[PDB]
Amino acid sequence: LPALKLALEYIVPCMNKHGICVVDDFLGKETGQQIGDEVRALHDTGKFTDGQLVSQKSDSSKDIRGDKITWIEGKEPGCETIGLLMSSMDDLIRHCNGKLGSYKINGRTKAMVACYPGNGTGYVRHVDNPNGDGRCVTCIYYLNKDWDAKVSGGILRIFPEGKAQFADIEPKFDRLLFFWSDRRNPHEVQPAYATRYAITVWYFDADERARAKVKYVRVEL
Ligand SMILES: Cn1c(O)c(C(=O)NCC(=O)O)c(=O)n(C)c1=O
Ligand SMILES: [Mn+2]
């Protein structure tokens, strides 16, 4: 669908009502699988980190490591389709501007490409932006074809604030996810027993980001 119809008829109302929004089949099989090929290419050539240190053993060779990451601008060689994903995200947000809460989005981070190795590691419950660092919207794109959470785990579990319930989101291929980055959406990644790829971008509210600068940019006189 065109960025605008999806943004105006589905994403905006869904975010303002629930603070979470799931869009399936965002780019199609062709583009999605190309992005998967680029991400897997980055992983195979060692562009990722060794992984988040989960359990630090007194013996170093026993240290267990979890999610691996790499920051992608989208202009790198062999990342053109990732850059196209980021451009499409940016189009959606552009068409949403002024309608997502009271936020005026004026920037974003680079793309955090994450790979859970499938060694039973996940990601602890957390809030993305708990201290007003300027990020208002989390946007995640998943790449895992034929994912069976009953078999592979890796579910994203969100605990919407005030609501006695949690929302389970499987990291499905060609799935796009939006949710408020602040304390409204604490969330965790449940242990993944299969390789789990995702691409996250965070969008900045102009006012919050502007006053985060003093919350921490100097000029010699
Ligand atoms: C700061 N940070 C996160 O907030 C992640 C996160 O919330 N992922 C949700 C999901 O993949 O469904 C994450 O995965 N990684 C690697 C990370 O570094
Ligand atoms: Mn998170």
UniProtKB/Swiss-Prot annotation:
Its cofactor is Fe(2+); L-ascorbate. Changing C21A: Little change in enzyme activity. Following exposure to hypoxia, activated in HeLa cells but not in cardiovascular cells. Changing P130R: In ECYT3; marked decrease in enzyme activity. It is an enzyme of class 1 (oxidoreductase). Changing C136A: Little change in enzyme activity. Fe cation binds at H126, D128, H187. Keywords: Acetylation, Congenital erythrocytosis, Cytoplasm, Dioxygenase, Disease variant, Iron, Metal-binding, Nucleus, Oxidoreductase, Phosphoprotein, S-nitrosylation, Vitamin C, Zinc, Zinc-finger. According to PubMed:11056053, widely expressed with highest levels in skeletal muscle and heart, moderate levels in pancreas, brain (dopaminergic neurons of adult and fetal substantia nigra) and kidney, and lower levels in lung and liver. According to PubMed:12351678 widely expressed with highest levels in brain, kidney and adrenal gland. Expressed in cardiac myocytes, aortic endothelial cells and coronary artery smooth muscle. According to PubMed:12788921; expressed in adult and fetal heart, brain, liver, lung, skeletal muscle and kidney. Also expressed in placenta. Residues 54-64 are annotated as: Beta(2)beta(3) 'finger-like' loop. Binds 1 Fe(2+) ion per subunit. Its EC number is 1.14.11.29. The keyword Acyltransferase does not apply. Monomer. Interacts with ING4; the interaction inhibits the hydroxylation of HIF alpha proteins. Interacts with PTGES3 (via PXLE motif); thereby recruiting EGLN1 to the HSP90 pathway to facilitate HIF alpha proteins hydroxylation. Interacts with LIMD1. Found in a complex composed of LIMD1, VHL, EGLN1/PHD2, ELOB and CUL2. Interacts with EPAS1. Interacts with CBFA2T3. Interacts with HIF1A. It is linked to Erythrocytosis, familial, 3: An autosomal dominant disorder characterized by elevated serum hemoglobin and hematocrit, and normal serum erythropoietin levels. This is Egl nine homolog 1. It comes from Homo sapiens (Human). The gene is EGLN1. The chain holds residues 188 to 414 of 426 of the full protein.
